Design a protein around this nucleic acid. Sequence first.
DNA 1: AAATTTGTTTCAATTTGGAGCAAATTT
DNA 2: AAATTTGCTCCAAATTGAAACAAATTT
Lengths: 98, 91
Amino acid sequence: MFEQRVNSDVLTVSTVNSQDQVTQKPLRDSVKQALKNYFAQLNGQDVNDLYELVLAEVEQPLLDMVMQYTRGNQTRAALMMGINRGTLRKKLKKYGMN
Amino acid sequence: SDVLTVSTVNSQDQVTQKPLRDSVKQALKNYFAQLNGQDVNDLYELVLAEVEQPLLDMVMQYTRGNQTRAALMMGINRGTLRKKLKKYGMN
DNA sequence: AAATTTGTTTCAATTTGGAGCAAATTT
DNA sequence: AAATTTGCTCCAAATTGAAACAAATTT
């Protein structure tokens, strides 16, 4: 049979463990570390824009990558992200990606 | 200048920040490699799910379960926050 | 030459938001 | 006992969708 691949393991990153051994942790964990570190450093400051801050950090590289894959083809890129072709066009504009 | 970064270690044992966006790129590079032209279908929802969870999980930590505060920190309607928490069954 | 994608629209569907309130919970 | 937060509403503002169609482009 096929071994189960849980959703947390579809997107992963190389990490190194306490034994100089390259293993492969979830992307969720990267996001976790990012915010942990954001919070420590935040130190007293009030925040208002944390969702957009994150979402922007993540949409950029996603859009970047999917366009590379679709060799610049917007119809496929939107189709594979499962978003309307209009929305994609809009996100790309947002990020000066054209 | 980059508020959202993660820690990397190089071969010389030196630790060093790296923007989170780089990790997300890596993730996807890899996703696509393994895919051998199998069609991808809801990549956006996929990644969104992978990000909102640890986001929700950590602001709730930080705001000690205070939904009103969390919703303000993130800048989304308090109603929206509930919806999401339900979406991932974090209520 | 044919097929596809792009760059627009216009309008409908869904989601996000803002506010208001009693009931609960924290302070 | 006050103040703040929760769990609702109802609406309205905004974003997302979908479908169309010349005109540009890629096959």
